Design an enzyme around this catalytic site. Structure first.
Site, short mmCIF file in Angstrom:
data_model
loop_
_atom_site.label_atom_id
_atom_site.label_comp_id
_atom_site.label_asym_id
_atom_site.label_seq_id
_atom_site.Cartn_x
_atom_site.Cartn_y
_atom_site.Cartn_z
N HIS A 41 49.40 34.52 43.21
CA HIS A 41 49.22 34.57 42.06
C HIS A 41 50.39 35.45 41.31
CE1 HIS A 41 47.57 38.62 41.73
NE2 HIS A 41 46.35 38.07 42.47
N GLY A 143 47.36 46.48 39.05
CA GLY A 143 48.35 46.94 39.88
C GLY A 143 48.26 46.79 41.47
N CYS A 145 46.77 44.92 43.38
CA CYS A 145 46.73 43.22 44.18
C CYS A 145 48.00 43.37 45.38
CB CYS A 145 47.05 42.27 43.46
SG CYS A 145 45.74 42.07 42.05
#
Ligand SMILES: N#Cc1ccccc1CN1CCCN(C(=O)c2cncc(Cl)c2)CC1
Ligand SMILES: N#Cc1ccccc1CN1CCCN(C(=O)c2cncc(Cl)c2)CC1
Ligand SMILES: [Cl-]
Ligand code: NA
Lengths: 302, 306
Positions: A41, A143, A145
């Site tokens: 993503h 932030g 991920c």
């Protein structure tokens, strides 16, 4: 003596964390040998997230669109590909700090350490369990991920989790390092929810054995039960069924304390039926289910 | 979202852990630059432990009586000295993995990460708080002496604790990195016991503010309290007194949530009186006191879930 929620030492994993940037999106990557692994993503805009066609979004990107920063050094991306929900960015430098490692997929009930990261920099380490509903009760902000979960089996790091998103109830969802989600989740901004969770029975029993080893014995009683009668009670309280595999795994703890597994099951039945009556176990007023039998043996004996 | 007991990443400290051996005793040491720090009781026998004369035991040792092992490499001891209850062994190699560091002595209520070690090898990491009675509720077994406590606010490691012993109640005692014990404890096998412990009030308030930031307000009430009436009630539940310093320190959390400090004190008074009535706060059925105001700010979102 003492019993704490303990994570593995995180040094071997800290030396693998990098920052991955694509457009305006910045998140974390895992740099092992000459590949950087991160959530696919990272290539999406907010509008793409509603219904992304990842193959189509990826074809429009060149290697130079991915900025990878390891500490203060820029790594050169020389290739890119997707494996399930993870992006694999081939880089021109092998990580000199790559530990001995494997990618393993864990089962619900198993625990692991999470190294929470922001902008490729590790911020904290804590222990998590994969819930029966395939979520983790982590602590993650915007932030985070690409932060990873792992276990250490001697000198070998077994990577088992990569963070992708937070569900509406504040619990977390992610994939294994091969990009397969744990649970029925997808990497798109559509309506998703954690299913009803249950308590990990074999882990509550392991923690009751940890309490006895540490001198907390008030809940022990003269009774025993059968596996079938215990499972009738467990189902009523939204506890996972206890199998003969679970009984076998608790064998060593049972032998050390002199409390047979079904003898500890009778204590647990009583605790579920009557509560704690104002008392605590290992400083807790609730039955803890995020320590596996192995975690107890590793901390109480090693 | 979420709220967990979170330790600092331990890599910077793992690169400093070594094994120190003297006679038949083996424990952990901390290798920073060309010095290895460890508990001075490494030079004692079990019989010495009742009334050890450390100066007399140490004068009989040469540099080569101390064996220091870093991984699979033996380091050469070229000097030794005692500073309070720590032994400082000068070695012939500076640790190439020495991080940016400082030694800080902490106050009760402060938290830190512990890197539990055995034979110079790290085993696990967890968060601890210095209790008001100067003990820590850790997880330590035989061989863990010399394991250290630290914080890493920025890229600098602040070492604040070195493990020396376990008290009869199963709680733990140790020193700062200058060898001064926390509390009235000594490195000798005499009858010594932890004083009655109390709850760290400022930290429970910080954690109630964390629950509000994360979207939970069930425990709030329409009342306020004076600081003096709050302390009179709190002391009846064995809570530490809350001072004006503590009220000042909670200012930022109060501003973020819109809940005045003395208004949060009134919520705490009510929780002590009523209990939780089957409810939980941040997944706990007890009031948590091992998160400081600074820990809450570090972990929580800067935007409250209104
Ligand atoms: N896959 C997926 C998915 C699926 C449904 C919706 C949104 C996403 C991705 N999404 C966007 C990137 C930024 N983001 C965080 O950085 C984050 C992580 N953890 C916790 C928090 Cl509070 C924030 C949220 C995750
Ligand atoms: N200073 C001091 C002191 C003062 C009073 C008594 C005993 C000692 C030292 N003593 C001897 C060395 C070995 N030891 C452990 O290795 C240990 C650590 N933590 C927890 C556990 Cl269960 C065991 C116990 C500590
Ligand atoms: Cl302090
Ligand atoms: Na029983």
């Amino acid at each position: 003596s003492g019993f704490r929620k303990m994570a593995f030492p995180s040094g071997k994993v800290e030396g693998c964390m990098v920052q991955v940037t694509c457009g305006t999106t910045t998140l974390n990557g895992l740099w092992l040998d000459d590949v950087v692994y991160c959530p696919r993503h990272v290539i999406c805009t907010s509008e793409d997230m509603l219904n992304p066609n990842y193959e189509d979004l990826l074809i429009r990107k060149s290697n130079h669109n991915f900025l990878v920063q390891a500490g203060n050094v820029q790594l050169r991306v020389i290739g890119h590909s997707m494996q399930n929900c993870v992006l694999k960015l081939k880089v021109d430098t092998a990580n000199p700090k790559t530990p001995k490692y494997k990618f393993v997929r864990i089962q619900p009930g198993q625990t692991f350490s999470v190294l929470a990261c922001y902008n490729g920099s590790p911020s904290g380490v804590y222990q998590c369990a994969m819930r029966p509903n395939f979520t983790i009760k982590g602590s993650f902000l915007n932030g985070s991920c690409g932060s990873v979960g792992f276990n250490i089996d001697y000198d070998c790091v077994s990577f088992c989790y990569m963070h992708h998103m937070e569900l509406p109830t504040g619990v977390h969802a992610g994939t294994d390092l091969e990009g397969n989600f744990y649970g029925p989740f997808v990497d798109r901004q559509t309506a998703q929810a954690a299913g009803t969770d249950t308590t990990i029975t074999v882990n509550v029993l392991a923690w009751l054995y940890a309490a006895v080893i540490n001198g907390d014995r008030w809940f022990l009683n003269r009774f025993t039960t059968t596996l079938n009668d215990f499972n009738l009670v467990a189902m009523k309280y939204n506890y996972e069924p206890l199998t003969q595999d679970h009984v076998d795994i608790l064998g060593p703890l049972s032998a050390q304390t002199g409390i047979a597994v079904l003898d500890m099951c009778a204590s647990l039945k009583e605790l579920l039926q009557n509560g704690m009556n104002g008392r605590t176990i290992l400083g807790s007023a609730l039955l803890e289910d995020e320590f596996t039998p192995f975690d107890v043996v590793r901390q109480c004996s090693g």
